[PDB]
A paper describes a structure:
Most insects, including human-targeting mosquitoes, detect odors through odorant-activated ion channel complexes consisting of a divergent odorant-binding subunit (OR) and a conserved co-receptor subunit (Orco). As a basis for understanding how odorants activate these heteromeric receptors, we report here cryo-EM structures of two different heteromeric odorant receptor complexes containing ORs from disease-vector mosquitos Aedes aegypti or Anopheles gambiae. We determined the structure of a heteromeric complex formed by ORs from these species in complex with a Apocrypta bakeri fig wasp Orco that is amenable to structural determination. We find that these complexes form asymmetric tetramers containing 1 OR and 3 Orco subunits, where activation of the sole OR subunit upon ligand binding suffices to open the ion conduction pathway.
To determine if the 1:3 subunit stoichiometry can be observed with other members of the OR family, we turned to studying the OR28 receptor of An. gambiae, a main vector of malaria, that responds to the natural odorants acetophenone (a plant volatile) and 2,4,5-trimethylthiazole (henceforth TMT; an animal odor, originally isolated from anal secretions of mammals). The cryo-EM dataset of the unbound structure also contains an active state, suggesting that, like the AaOR10/Orco complex, the AgOR28/Orco complex exists in an equilibrium between states in the absence of odorant. Overall, subunit stoichiometry, mechanism of pore opening and ligand binding of the AgOR28/Orco complex largely resembles the observations of the AaOR10/Orco complex, suggesting that these might be conserved features of this family of proteins.
Author numbering:
A (entry chain D): 3 to 397
B (entry chain A), C (entry chain B), D (entry chain C): 4 to 159, 168 to 243, 313 to 473
Write the structure that this text describes.
Amino acid sequence: RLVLHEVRYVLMAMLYISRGMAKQIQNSTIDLYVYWFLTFIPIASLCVPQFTYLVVDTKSLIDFISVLVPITEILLTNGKMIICNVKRGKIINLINQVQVAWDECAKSEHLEIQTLITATAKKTKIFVIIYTTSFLLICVEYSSMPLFKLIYHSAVYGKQSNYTIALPYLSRFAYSTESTTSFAWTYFFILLGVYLLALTLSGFDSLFATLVMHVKMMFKVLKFEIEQLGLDLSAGKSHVELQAKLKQIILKHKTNLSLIEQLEDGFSFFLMAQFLTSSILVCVVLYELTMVFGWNEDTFKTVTYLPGAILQLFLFCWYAQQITEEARLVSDHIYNIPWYLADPKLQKDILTFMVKAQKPTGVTASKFYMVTLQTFQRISSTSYSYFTLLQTINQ
Amino acid sequence: KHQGLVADLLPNIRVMQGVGHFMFNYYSEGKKFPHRIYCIVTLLLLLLQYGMMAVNLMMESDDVDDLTANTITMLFFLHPIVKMIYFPVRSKIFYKTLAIWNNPNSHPLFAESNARFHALAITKMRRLLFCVAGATIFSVISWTGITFIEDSVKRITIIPIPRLMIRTFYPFNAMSGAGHVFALIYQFYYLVISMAVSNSLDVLFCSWLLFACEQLQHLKAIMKPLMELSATGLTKKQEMLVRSAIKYWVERHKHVVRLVTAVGDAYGVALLLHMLTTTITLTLLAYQATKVNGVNVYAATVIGYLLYTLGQVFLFCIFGNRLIEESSSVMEAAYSCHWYDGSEEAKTFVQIVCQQCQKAMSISGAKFFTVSLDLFASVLGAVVTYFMVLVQL
Amino acid sequence: KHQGLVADLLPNIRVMQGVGHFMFNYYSEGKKFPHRIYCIVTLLLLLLQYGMMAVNLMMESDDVDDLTANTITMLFFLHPIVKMIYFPVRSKIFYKTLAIWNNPNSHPLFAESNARFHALAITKMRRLLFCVAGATIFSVISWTGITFIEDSVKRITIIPIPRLMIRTFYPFNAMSGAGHVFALIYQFYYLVISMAVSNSLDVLFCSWLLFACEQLQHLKAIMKPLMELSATGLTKKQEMLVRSAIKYWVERHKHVVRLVTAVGDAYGVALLLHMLTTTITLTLLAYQATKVNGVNVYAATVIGYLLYTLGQVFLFCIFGNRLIEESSSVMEAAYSCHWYDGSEEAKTFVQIVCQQCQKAMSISGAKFFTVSLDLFASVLGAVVTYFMVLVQL
Amino acid sequence: KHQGLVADLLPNIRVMQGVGHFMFNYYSEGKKFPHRIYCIVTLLLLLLQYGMMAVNLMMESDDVDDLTANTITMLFFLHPIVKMIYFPVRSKIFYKTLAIWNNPNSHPLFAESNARFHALAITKMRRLLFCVAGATIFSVISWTGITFIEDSVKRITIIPIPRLMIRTFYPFNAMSGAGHVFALIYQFYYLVISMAVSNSLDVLFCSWLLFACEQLQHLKAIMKPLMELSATGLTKKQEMLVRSAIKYWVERHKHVVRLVTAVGDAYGVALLLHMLTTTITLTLLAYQATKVNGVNVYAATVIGYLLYTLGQVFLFCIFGNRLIEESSSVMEAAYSCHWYDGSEEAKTFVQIVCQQCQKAMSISGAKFFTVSLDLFASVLGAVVTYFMVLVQL
């Protein structure tokens, strides 16, 4: 029970929803305002100081770009916070509808559907756990490295350590930090902001992927029902029974299409902003690497900044591709039954079904384009072309 | 100013007539004479200033940067002149379009939704007109202010240059005397009128598109209960009712298609000319942006030019894309009813409609491109790539 | 010269034969021998002149500007040679295409529409042929005049050069004596013949396309009354009549499809070669335009070259685009009849026709591209972008 | 061997096994153990040579041109290693594909046609293999030829370099008689084996596609007598006969679809890796072509590299494009028959088949793209554009 269980846990850990573990989640304004207040925390603790340092303290273009990449990632995460806070109602309604569909499926008497259910649950749990754990580990390490350095230095060299601690990021605040109290409180707020951002990234990416997985499971259930209709066609049952079975199949198809519609409605702007920012960051980091090519310390940072961006893009591209692929394959599933054994009326109904099922249905990026794996291919091609042209035109 | 689609757009028609977009068609003949002269005068004034601008560009060709700025100004102010001359030559097709919806169809069962969506369309048209008017006024005020916050100076040594909103050569001493204030008044009038005519023609195009989209919305809304009417064996009267409803739906869809084709006929060449001018404007603007260093006046001017140009393109693309989306989504609206429970006529009608809807309605810029957000994305990518190539070199 | 689609194209065939496009098929056999020798002679002369141009390229390779001009001329005059050789090797498919419409179908009810649209097609072919001939003559006259308005001088020091319409190397002294006038006459004949052969082949292609488009127009025009013929249940005579009308419509559509496929087979490789030569021509022409400064002779020559090349491409693209548009609009014409009032066979016929019209007829250049205004726009954008990059560098 | 689709492709399988392409599936068990050992040795040898090349790259990295040459050779010879390792890991899906057509459908009326087209397929397959084999051999010979007509020298002063067919570092002397002869023999073996394995896998893919296309051709050819059988009210026996014919058609079409799906599953990642390598190959090759100045050896080597790379890409693309064209031609041929004379079942069958065929079969490089002439055109355009930019800079 409780589809997206680990997703509900991670969302609750963020205060996004206070009653996530309910069968029918409720949208309450208290969560909305609490989440807005939380959203304003990383902006003040991370975004503003880093942006101020970027604008003021930077002395060269290399430093500008190196400081600009992480700031861009943080700004994108904050934008994700705001976008999902705005789309709260649609996202929650989508989760509720997915839960309703899962509850309807779980009453099945067919072992194939039960196996699908168990596989889907296991997949979602494992994916959520891995993704959230990895991102929390990365962010915690990056933030707390100097704290661990201080602890280790104090333990080893005692009071003779010639080590002075500094904040986890290169940033400039409006007030001083030489005071111990101010330093401690700013550090605590920085950790709170980092924790919120990491939970945002992990939870919302996991929510998108897991909703895609559940829609895929629903499409597989539809495939099973179509195959059962084919078997009933072969067995030669009267016309009315075949009409009823086809009607049920069409209703299930409509339900799955509605779920895809809701997912697209909820995540269109999210995907658009994600892809735009990721592509621009890839171009910027490629430029920086070109300017500082060769064996040196600078190349390391860019080499680290890239893989996060590429994998984050690939996740969304892969799962949007799965949605599109299943929606398309519905047509093949309906073509492969022995429709020629049915009298012409049922064949015409199947023809309308097939006409609808062939239309490309997926998830768009603000309607600019439909997201699939070809989108990742195009981004990669443009990145490679930009890289090569930059190298040649350099001299 | 009575029949449908002219009463709805009457405020926009009045704006266009007021600015000087000819259109000696939608008032009493008594006003037919005077207005005409006014139009001519406006045109002449425009050309005059335009000519006096071009002359300046002739003696500003010694340098490249000033030449680039003058060329950008000339193209920006060429847009309105092209539009103003373009309308009267095609006034025949324009008036044919404005009278397309004079005698639409009607069915008793769908009158309420028809009226509701007609009213919604009118409200959306008025909102669009007011928003574009506000944007135009804001642009005029921004120009008139930026011309004053900055400092008028020519670099050679330092040589003072008359403080004017638009660089121009004048026979008189337009520096400090009454010629200065006359030049400011004339340039303000020029700015207001040029922006007004250009944006008003654009708004008329977009309003046609909005009306088409709302008619498609009404078609889907009534698609939902049409099948329920069909589903129910049936008596002769019910079959006749289903036939009449299907006839109404098909005829209204054909009417919308006719309107879209007429709009394309009317505005394709105008779109082509707009994009042709834009291309060069954006090229020069990318070169200009290559020289930006800081947040001084130069940056403000360049960003303003880029924003205005891309905003015009973006309005056109928004409304083309919306038309495409509604035309496509007709199929989704047709699929989501109880078509499997209908009679044979209703199911065949749904089949044929679904087959028809596979191709989305669109407006083509003289068959060289279609207006949609894809076009805007391509334009933006092209300009960004050109700017990157420039800055690298 | 008696059967359909050859009686219609007969002026085109006669012009092609007169210019020397082989094609020994459409006259009394008594003339087959003489004409043949004439054709061979022309080719020889062409190649001869062509060769002497290439020779001149070899000794002009010291500099890059003269090398670029020579290469542009060489490709421009490669076009007609390739077309002239191409026709005879593929003559069988050409003759198959020209005899494709010898036995079309006929229905009593649709005879008047067929005759009207056939006549319209013939008039359009004649108009296109006359316009292309006029353009060719204008180009020849412009070349022959510009060669005289300019000054024949070569730069090292100033070296006088023969005043000829085409740069060429001649064993004799073609400067002042009778050699000069002989060279002038020979080069005039060369220009006329080359342009004539190339443009005549292209015009035959375009005439095929126009015939196809007019047949599609006839199909739509008759689709309108076909449904009303079905709508009215029907007595057996009425059902036979509707079946006959549907048979006629489907068979005629299939015939048009056959004609389009035949044209594609005939001319795909020719299109591919034409665009292959164009690409390099346009690249070199962009580099040449990069050197223009003023309104002198050089600018006129460059603009003329670009105009001619883009005109050939534009002709191909416009006619391909027209074919695509008519084929697509068949679906709109099928939707716009009163099918909702028709019978079941008529409705199924409409559904199948819409399914078929979902895809548009087109001509592809050996499956490597399609000829449409999109191709012309892409070519133009590529050349403009290359020019911009060149000027920046 | 005694089952379809492995009987037809047996020469390809035998060639693959002969060159050391694993595939221990299609002979008596007695040869299972010897063959395996051979395969391992070949792989070992391959890798060893590869490594011996890479070491050379390390000592030839201070200079930049030889770095480019070595990298191009390394990627060229990377292709075969990747294919060789790729086959065994995915051998299960390959064997699943090869066993698709062991039990196909059969109908008395369409048997003869089937047989004919089946025969046709085999013929084409054979031709393809032979052609590719020839090409492969030619390449090897040309390679060896060039290695003896050029002069083996290195620029630092001139230092004599060992005269081998591939630049490599060897513990042996590699210049005296024994080492030189052994190196020549080993490198000849390397070239033959690498080209053979790569092209053999490619030809297997293309032969699968050829078989699918010929099956589609058979379906299109037999679709006419099917309808004529339907057309004629029908007695019960005729209804059953038409139903059996429709069942045969649909089942064979579904079988072809299954075969295409299996082929895509088998070869998608191979295509993806192929194009990933080819992209860098072509980038480096464009930079290399930038330095051509007419010298026979260098120009010939660069042209050979480019020709081989683009030929591999072209083979894949052309066969994918043929598959797409046949898939759509299925709809085209379903239209062009006497359905208007048929019964309700036949017309509904036509409608459903056309609707299904609206979407063309295709092969994708793991969904990252589609293999067709468009992909080859994109690769060619990218390389040409990069070359032009490079030469201008």
